[model samples]
Target: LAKRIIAALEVKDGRVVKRDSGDPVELGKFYSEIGIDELVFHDHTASVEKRKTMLELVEKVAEQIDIPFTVGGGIHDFETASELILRGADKVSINTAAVENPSLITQIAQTFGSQAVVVAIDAKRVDGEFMVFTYSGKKNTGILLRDWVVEVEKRGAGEILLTSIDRDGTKSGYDTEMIRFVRPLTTLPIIASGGAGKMEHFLEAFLAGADAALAASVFHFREIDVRELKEYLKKHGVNVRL
Candidate 1:
């Protein structure tokens, strides 16, 4: 275990609505203070027409921390993503933007380098078909996940963040079928997001080929502290950052 976990903090409704809080950035920083490896801030509300990720939110978050920060939500193009990176973000996770245009992955990778391009794929199951969705899970693109991942990888995406909307906040476990679908198609780092309410789920994800495990409600409700989860994974022989 690396003992350096890249913790993720999901932000929604501008106030960090992490099933646990109206403010997750403050919670994120508190973990950073205790020495986390990296932190990810996911904005679930970016697809809406309103604020588009609240630049003011990032500005405030930027002011609060010194550790690495990755921001996603409302990023639609190279310009927006680059702005975030230049302003203080180490990486940007592009979701609906990429689903809206699969080519955006290649453009961002070409312009900013592959390492900075994190493609967030929101997925849902449709009667045995694993299709990707956009606009905060409202619009299903009808794109088979396997096909989409291959295209994205060929386009130079350095990382893929896979979320199972059907499994989101369920805590039952990660959707291994989704991992199995992507593991063979892409070579980039994959973050297994959604349905992780316990250490076992993370272990299962890693065994299924996920490079990292992600959660939203677990942390939001304080169901499990990030550090404690890492420790549990280490005990289970999973390579994780503490």
Candidate 2:
């Protein structure tokens, strides 16, 4: 399979926050046009009342972009997962909910097929052990990252979107060590997230065994162009869609 370059948008109250990019719908279109393999929208809004805005944004973004996209955050049940798919999300990512109820992974995968279910794992190195964190990387779950990866795969997750909480927003680089640790554990595709500062960081992730590389600030801040990154990766002999 060709390696993927994905753009991650952190949405809050229906607007793109974290890095404060303007208008997610417009940004989604721009990334699609520039050769991004996929897009992932994470709704950071906490209120249930405010979640309606994210649904509307999903519809608008879906209508505007031709590339595949995933929507996550606050999706706790099968109903919410189906709602996002019906609204045009190619995949639904679950983190907190999946940890709370492991069967939710199988439930969604059984209904929509495994390809539509992505298990997003927020991991942090706690006392030399990679532990799973939930609630947007706020709470430590005490579950080893290795155990959760095996369980999610057995329970029918199609992909793993692994983000390093320690490296997130730091732009230092991806946790290649973590990627290398999890690579041999499962056959499921792994999407590496967090701390992507430059093209070399992405190359390092891929060489370390990530199937896809995801980033937010670098792309949003226009510090890295997806097309240029793809070209650079292609030159480095990484199989990427140009």
Candidate 3:
């Protein structure tokens, strides 16, 4: 498969509150029209009251966009996972839930197939060891990043969305070291997230073994053009959908 460029939208209370705010559906449509390979909508609120609102936003985004999209946050069980899929999300990404209930990964994979399950891991280097953190990078899980990656793959996760908490929002670059560390551990495609500032950063992630490069601020704020990035990648001999 060709390398992918994914646009991430962080939503809170049914609105995109990622940096400069915007409507989720409009952003989804814009990115889709501009050739983003995929879209990821992460509901930051995740409260009971906001769950319904997120689902409604997902439905609206599904109706407006053509590219495959993934929905994350607040999905704890198979019912919610299946509901998201039925409502038009191509895949469901789980982070806190996956750690809380490891079998939930296998459960969703069994019914929806492995390809529909994406396990998002937020990791930060602690005392020279990469440790997993949950609850949006607040609580440390005391789990080694390597151990979690191995476990998720064994549990039938299709892909790993690895975000380096240390490098996140730094705009320096991806933690290619982390990507290299996790790449050889599992065959699952790794979607590298966080710290994307320049076009070269995406190429570096791909070279480091990321199957896809996901960014929010750059794409959301119009700092990077999707087509230009793909062209740059192609020029550098990286396979991407043009």
For candidate 3, report its TM-score. Answer: 0.97
**TM-scores of all predicted structures:** 0.86, 0.96, 0.97
- Reference-based lDDT, each prediction: 0.76, 0.92, 0.92
Per-residue lDDT tens digits for candidate 2, residues 44-73, read 776765557767977998888999999998
Off by over 4 Å in 2: 18-21
Ranking by TM-score: 3, 2, 1
Error of 3 at 187 (Å): 0.4
TM-score of predicted structure 1: 0.86
Put down candidate 1 lDDT per residue, 30-127, tens digits, no spaces. Answer: 76775566678877663553244556556777888787667886687878787777766777888888877878888878877988888889898898
Q: Model 3, residue 20: what's the lDDT?
A: 26
Query: Hey, what RMSD does candidate 1 come out at?
Result: 3.1
